[PDB]
Design a protein around this ligand. Sequence first.
Ligand code: HEM
Ligand SMILES: CC(C)N(c1cccc(-c2cnco2)c1)S(=O)(=O)c1cccc(Cl)c1
Length: 434
Amino acid sequence: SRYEHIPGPPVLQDVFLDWAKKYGPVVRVNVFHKTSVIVTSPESVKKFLMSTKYNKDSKMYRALQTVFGERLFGQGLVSECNYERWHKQRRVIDLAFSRSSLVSLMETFNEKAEQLVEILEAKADGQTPVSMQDMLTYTAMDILAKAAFGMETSMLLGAQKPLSQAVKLMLEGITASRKRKQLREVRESIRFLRQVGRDWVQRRREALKRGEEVPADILTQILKAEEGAQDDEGLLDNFVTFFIAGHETSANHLAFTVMELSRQPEIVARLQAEVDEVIGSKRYLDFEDLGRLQYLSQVLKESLRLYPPAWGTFRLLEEETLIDGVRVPGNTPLLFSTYVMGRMDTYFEDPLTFNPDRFGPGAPKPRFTYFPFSLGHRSCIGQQFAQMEVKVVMAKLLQRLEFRLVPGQRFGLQEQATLKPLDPVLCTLRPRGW
Ligand code: HEM
Ligand SMILES: CC(C)N(c1cccc(-c2cnco2)c1)S(=O)(=O)c1cccc(Cl)c1
């Protein structure tokens, strides 16, 4: 009753879209364990996301914190809702994301991209069906394992199959929580990953004790953040956090892009020409090269408009407030969705048209209607890491390979925590040059 006055009805994100179009910029939803309000006006996006006065709603994030009694993200960097505790760990971990820290990862990005491309080249008979979803997540996993934790997962070599099963099952579990054997598998998956965390953490401390060389990475900084804890629960919270966040959304984004570009030959031909002109025959992309891939840069932005893996963020409204002419009571979770806003014609002309020119220099920039890495103090720490990562992978693909989506492969979405292609993005492949 306390929310009955708010406009509302008497893939779920598409229902959110229908509701936003039908009911306006402030709509109540009852799908989560708590009534919440989805807010889709730019003014509100700006007001709520671009302020330190508004914090994440812990009731909504507890779904990431613990899954079916089993601690997952805990109080790591994504799911920590206390400002003081968040701010402390953010600033320590920030160091691993400095310009120079990121620049030094170019070798890892290039190596794993080059491995992927050679693996695909060997299958490029225009006949063999290849799951680009699988191949791209293997690549994202291998990049992250090495870049963040100094570990070689070798998923591109077909290793660590149990590990990717664990990730899959726990992600499905986050959404499902919104029988007997599903719960068992999910719980086991979560514990498996935290145990992997302990393993790799042990390996690092031992490396350190034996006075071996340890490059400064994300793991260095999540250890620094926990210098005087009474246990390793915070450490493992952050391990899991970065282990998942550090590859899942990147994988989703890559898969979405390849899927869409597979029906955009004109754009692909343009992307192919850009890559040819800037890197040439080179096998390695420098940092400075990434900047000159302007058209690919725009393509990836447009891919994030239509297909954002991270679809929602929540803030706690503490005091009753008027939001776009709607009275919203105090203690209410507010939902912000780049997915919904990206598909609204009031925000984007022909919203379902894939046009990279929307992000061309001299194009009017989306003013608070596009936020695939969110906005304000709780924006993605991994944003530049991701942008560089996916540019390197995409550029090597485009340099070397032609992709054709196997007929019957759908363009639909599925929700497994984040949004990703429903289908495995099966493609046949041919080398460039006939
Ligand atoms: C295309 C790839 C990526 C997308 C679209 C993306 C999107 C987002 C979004 C929307 C948030 C806000 C979360 C929230 O409001 O609850 C976020 C935060 C975060 N992302 Fe990402 N992300 C990406 C890649 C990465 C990478 C590569 C890393 C790690 C290397 C990462 C780690 C994080 C972390 C730790 C946070 C929490 C930051 C904080 O609150 O201080 N993400 N990301
Ligand atoms: C914006 C967040 C909370 N989402 C999300 C989830 C997992 C990893 C990442 C991530 C961020 N950076 C890298 O990975 C982002 S989500 O939108 O998928 C989501 C999922 C479940 C419930 C909700 Cl409410 C939202």
